[PDB]
Design a binder for these strands. Structure first.
Ligand code: NA
Ligand code: NA
Length: 327
DNA sequence: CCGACATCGCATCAGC
DNA sequence: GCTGATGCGA
DNA sequence: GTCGG
């Protein structure tokens, strides 16, 4: 499927999706439009009518009428009006600032704050997260070429091993699946001293070292198991400096680590196709564990896992290389 | 007709 | 001071 | 908004 097949429609649905999330605060309508947008984007035919599209799972009556109006006229009245609307368009835009959700955005617009410049005029009303999001608004909406990711990975794996050679670190996300670009860097971290039935300084030590060598620049949130922050590759010689990037680091217990690796590697569609197939065999798989369903649906104790493949084994399916986990 | 639609770590607010 | 709810991103 | 109990 190409973009210009049904791109006018998927852009329409995606636009409608954002206004539901950010302005109407209806998260379930948000995913409804996105699910419809996805299944249409995978549809290998140019859609002739709403009735044709309605045959797809996730496409109901209301969207069918909208596709008709778009197909027949080239636009959607409801969408045209909400675009022109000063309140709604401003509320929607502000949510693109990381740290500002639907709730904070509506508050700002309620008291006159509508633009990036308005935000810059009123920084004492922003929390720490929002300021970082404001500071790197442009940088956060850029994607990361795989070449820069590989360089980013080099630093992380190096500094992690430098703190303690027994750490195990894995950069997951679409990067691990071989993608040419990424939205952020997701790092998964474990250590033989950290199990389920188990120091709560393991994560701090790694974060601080990446701060010492000036890879990590800012902090959005940091706890005993999860870090969310900002990082930046060093500038080359006389070259232009790199954009600031989003990076996450999770500390996961050893016995839940490979369930964690598998889950955050994805993709989302793969994980459900895999979850579905998993239950047919009588197993339940989440981010943390793989558990055996009883005769009545009760969960047995979490099964031993020492690799990604161990999980694939449990449910009678051959190991899949990350590059072939798009679905 | 009507509930499900995934769930959780961290920051910060609402309330005691 | 604390506990729980909520917002946010994922 | 869509699906299904
Ligand atoms: Na349908
Ligand atoms: Na945001």
């Amino acid at each position: 499927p190409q973009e210009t097949l049904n791109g006018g429609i998927t852009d329409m649905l995606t636009e409608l999706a954002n206004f539901e999330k950010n302005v109407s605060q209806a998260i379930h309508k948000y995913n409804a439009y996105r699910k419809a947008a996805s299944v249409i984007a995978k549809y290998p035919h140019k859609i002739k009518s709403g009735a044709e599209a309605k045959k797809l799972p996730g496409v109901g009556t209301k969207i069918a009428e909208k596709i008709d109006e778009f197909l027949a006229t080239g636009k959607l009245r409801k969408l045209e009006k909400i675009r022109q609307d000063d309140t709604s368009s401003s509320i929607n835009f502000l949510t693109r600032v990381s740290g500002i959700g639907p709730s904070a955005a509506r508050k700002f617009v309620d008291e006159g704050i509508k633009t990036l410049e308005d935000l810059r005029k009123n920084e004492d009303k922003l929390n720490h997260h929002q300021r970082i999001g404001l500071k790197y608004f442009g940088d956060f909406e850029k994607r990361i070429p795989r070449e820069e990711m590989l360089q980013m990975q080099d630093i992380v794996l190096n500094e992690v091993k430098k703190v303690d050679s027994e750490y195990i670190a894995t950069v997951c996300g679409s990067f691990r699946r071989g993608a040419e670009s990424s939205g952020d860097m997701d790092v998964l971290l474990t250590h033989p001293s950290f199990t389920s039935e188990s120091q709560p300084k393991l994560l701090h030590q790694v974060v601080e070292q990446l701060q010492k060598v000036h890879f990590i620049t800012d902090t959005l949130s940091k706890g005993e198991t999860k870090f969310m922050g900002v990082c930046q590759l060093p500038s080359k010689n006389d070259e232009k400096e790199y954009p600031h990037r989003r990076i996450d680091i999770r500390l996961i217990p050893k016995d839940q680590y490979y369930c964690g690796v598998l889950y955050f590697t994805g993709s989302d569609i793969f994980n459900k196709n895999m979850r579905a197939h998993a239950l047919e065999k009588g197993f339940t798989i989440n981010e943390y564990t793989i558990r055996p369903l009883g005769v009545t649906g009760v969960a047995g104790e979490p099964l031993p896992v020492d690799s990604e493949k161990d999980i694939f084994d449990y449910i009678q399916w051959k190991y899949r290389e990350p590059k072939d986990r798009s679905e």
